[model samples]
Target: LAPGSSRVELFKRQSSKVPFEKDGKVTERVVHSFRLPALVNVDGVMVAIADARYETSFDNSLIDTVAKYSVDDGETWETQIAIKNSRASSVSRVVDPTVIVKGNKLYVLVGSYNSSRSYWTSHGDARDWDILLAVGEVTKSTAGGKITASIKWGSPVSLKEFFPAEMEGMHTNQFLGGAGVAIVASNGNLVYPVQVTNKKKQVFSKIFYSEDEGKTWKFGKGRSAFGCSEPVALEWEGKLIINTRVDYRRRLVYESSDMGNTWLEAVGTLSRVWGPSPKSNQPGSQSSFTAVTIEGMRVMLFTHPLNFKGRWLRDRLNLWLTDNQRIYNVGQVSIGDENSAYSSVLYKDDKLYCLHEINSNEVYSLVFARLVGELRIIKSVLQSWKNWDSHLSSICTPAGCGPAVTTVGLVGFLSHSATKTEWEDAYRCVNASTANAERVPNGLKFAGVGGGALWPVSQQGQNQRYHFANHAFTLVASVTIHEVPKGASPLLGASLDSSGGKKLLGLSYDKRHQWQPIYGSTPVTPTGSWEMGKRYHVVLTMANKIGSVYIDGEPLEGSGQTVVPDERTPDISHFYVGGYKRSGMPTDSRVTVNNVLLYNRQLNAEEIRTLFLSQDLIGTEAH
Candidate 1:
């Protein structure tokens, strides 16, 4: 990580305010909007490309394919180079630029409008209306220990003849281009995944590849995961995996061992590769995925807006990395803009160049920045991932691969026993905390409206400890309330922040003896009533967006469908007992929360029943 290698905007467009300002001063701009970024590392030179929209920021507006070339790892950049200007005519347009580096040639594939035919209105008429390729000769020169690259532009060519004859009817107005670079397979094949819209307007991601360098390109015979398109693909362990946009408000993933000939559902390589529910806004955004190996770990790094149940979405762009086994966050990248989306990245020589669109503060821009500090953190996390995985794998358990040397597996599990120190998890609670919580015989007791303990398991998939990596988990505890509290109070819960106010999901016991299921700011009154002085097993399980509470064995009803927990889980900081997170209401309930069990995956009713019935009979137990 080098100093002063942080952020720089390659292209910018300001909003329609009285006057748009840059650095507190007014600035000049040519384009109305710049979006759909495509970034590639030409050997060592970085070329960041995007759509330069003119006039109104609409799909039917005049747009051109533009690039900003950098020789100093994006610390500085050359001026905007119009790779394919739409000056051909007033109605002519080019957008959705995606690039690929084939040796010394940079192939830029873009989508252009067909005069009267838009993506939604066209029938199967002209394939060339939607696709064109500009080939550039990459010339490099080295002087005084510095190297620079220049593109000798050749006339753009039409790829109409390259379109597969069998797919013409369904691809009337659609073509393949995204905000990222094409992937070169381990076998040296250039593979580009494109969105293929059928005659019914349903979208699917299909691949076109050149098996023999750039000599010829052909399409695959089939596709997968209907209604999913605009794919970002990567070559992982010799297989091609595509993560795509599903109209149902989620990301759809598939893998093809035969280079897109056939695809199978492959959504587990990364932790929590999902999207938000339809009750919210669009769930998919263009992502730039780059797979690399560092320190013997096969890591896949990608850039996108990190998802959570927050007010803003695209404003939180981030870089996420996975080690094929576990996922980790590499920190945020889109800080300057209030809304930044559609990004691409280039990783070379341990440095990263990110190109993304910025629609912020009444200004629109295409920005590229060098991620130096992020690289350091990436490497460090990879080392940690390796060490942690090795340690977890070596634990000897009776059933084979388990967490104990003494007890391990799934994503995370915490078993806090009948000791005060044991109230913290990872068995011993390495980085844990407690407040007003005390030790007792049956288990730790929470005195009248007092306090609880916080175990150090990250609520999100950000880490391995008790990581609800995929927004699905089971929280179970055998608890007994000595007396009901003044009002609704938290018993066991998952919290999203340090302030203890934003409780993501929790089980609360109220003065009415009602077991209310709490999520976000809403608490649903349960159908049945619970009692004090009774040893009852309670469980809160969330599978994706659906969550429910089981008392003993039956699920509590009367919950609105939308009352379920969000699939876009946040950076839930801790797993807490008592009212540690119920900032309001009565956290003053006196309760004994015993055998607190947490699992990273949801538990079935049968499993919950058996767990409740599986406990040892206690002589001092209340009926």
Candidate 2:
């Protein structure tokens, strides 16, 4: 298996959309699908373990392992054997299976969440979670050019009792699904990243290491801020780097030169690649990072999705290459479906192996893809700039702010026209070089030059003004784009933070100029086209955990969910129109906003359509 002579191997497991009995109802228990695959080489055999989800979704799953032997490396696989969990029950579901091969033995670790004890009963334990392990011996047989192997797993044991007391309030209920391969440090210590949560239910990560092979494990202090989890660890130059999945649409990275003892945050090279934005419905997903030496050069490969359409539509699987200094996108391959995610990579010989899940129509199936190509890259997609604020113009004047609507739930209201401010709301311009108050159909046009305008909210009234928890809201904008802004540029939304470093809610357009609404964690983005030079009426409304987007009175689907922002919600201090708030100035956009409207209550679809079709209430009296 040389670098130049490489091939691809693909394997797919059961694909049942629903439960169906087999062989005269022998095992009435039907399989929904398989997920979270981890592959290891024990002796001369390839042992693959994945979650055999009994139910249709990821919540109800069981650990199932299989082994295939190929004496000629991985050229061919033979006779798969199912390594059962043995402790599985109807009420208990096990997930996030990982495996490590040391010597002639293989160790498997999994997490069990939710029990009948955790639910149904009045005296349920709040922390009814268990971490279990299984050990198996590798046995091989060779006869007449035929090779086979069997892995007999011992009884599963609970490792939850070994967690330290200081590690309380941690979400150790689950293991990392991708690249769960434990690394052997320079000190002969086996190290891995454990996913945890804070008291706020926001995800954080910690390191766990074992000094004596698979004998025992210990945990380190939690690392990273809120909204980070699903960590994968790799080692280079005796320093351990932990790559974690984050809801912020980017991966949060940390490095520990002291093995698994202490950690410091590091910037990820592929931060622009999307996951879930921070604070939406599904926050955390799985990614894989592995290090290998090829042609005397140290190489690292990572795999994750490339789009931010939503949390669950992980469609694109990309392979990013690096040399511990900088990363570049080698290329990407689509999973041919919207639900492709959670992959682990293993490099053996010259071929790289990946095991992952392809969820289609709620049916999750485990699959594998092997690639044999030169690790050398073609182009770089990494962001080269360090200072994010310099992208905005330094000199600017603010556009005049209009009156806030007097309606009870009218939190934000700004019309492009100056004559439409009937209510006694303060209107002023700041930092903009020029804001021409020209005449338009409904009102005055806040024509922009370098930067745009802002409507600042007082800190004292922050809670009452932009209250977002458990409440529905609507955002309406009348815009005409002379030219669409390109590349991860914000359109407009609430100023969620000072210095404009963080935005928890907003609308933006990607490089393709598609409309993407911001809810953090799982922001919904559209792939539809937007015609320039056309005046458009856009409305965004959210209620009951669902967010809907309407353009010219037509609803846009398959974008994202509308879950209430919990701990990650920002105290919005202002609303930016025609651009984003950047470094105390409104970064300008090519589009001109005719008006902006905000409602504290979610507007019905009919009401939104009517608002877009007509503008009769431009100067209505205060309610």
For TM-score, the strongest prediction is 1
Clash counts for the predictions, in order: 8, 18
In the range 198-303, model 2's lDDT, one tens digit per residue, is 3444556777778887578777664666656667778876777777776644466778886546777653222222334222234456777777765555667777
Q: Tally clashes: model 2.
A: 18
TM-score between model 1 and native = 0.64
> What lDDT does model 1 reach?
0.63
Q: Please list the residue runs of candidate 1 whose C-alpha ends up more than 4 Å from where it truly belongs after superposition.
A: 1-5, 14-29, 80-82, 85-88, 114-128, 143-146, 165-173, 269-272, 276-279, 306-313, 361-363, 393-410, 413-623
Whole-model lDDT values for every prediction: 0.63, 0.54
For candidate 2, give the lDDT of residue 139: 82
Ten residues in sequence with the least summed lDDT for candidate 1: 401-410
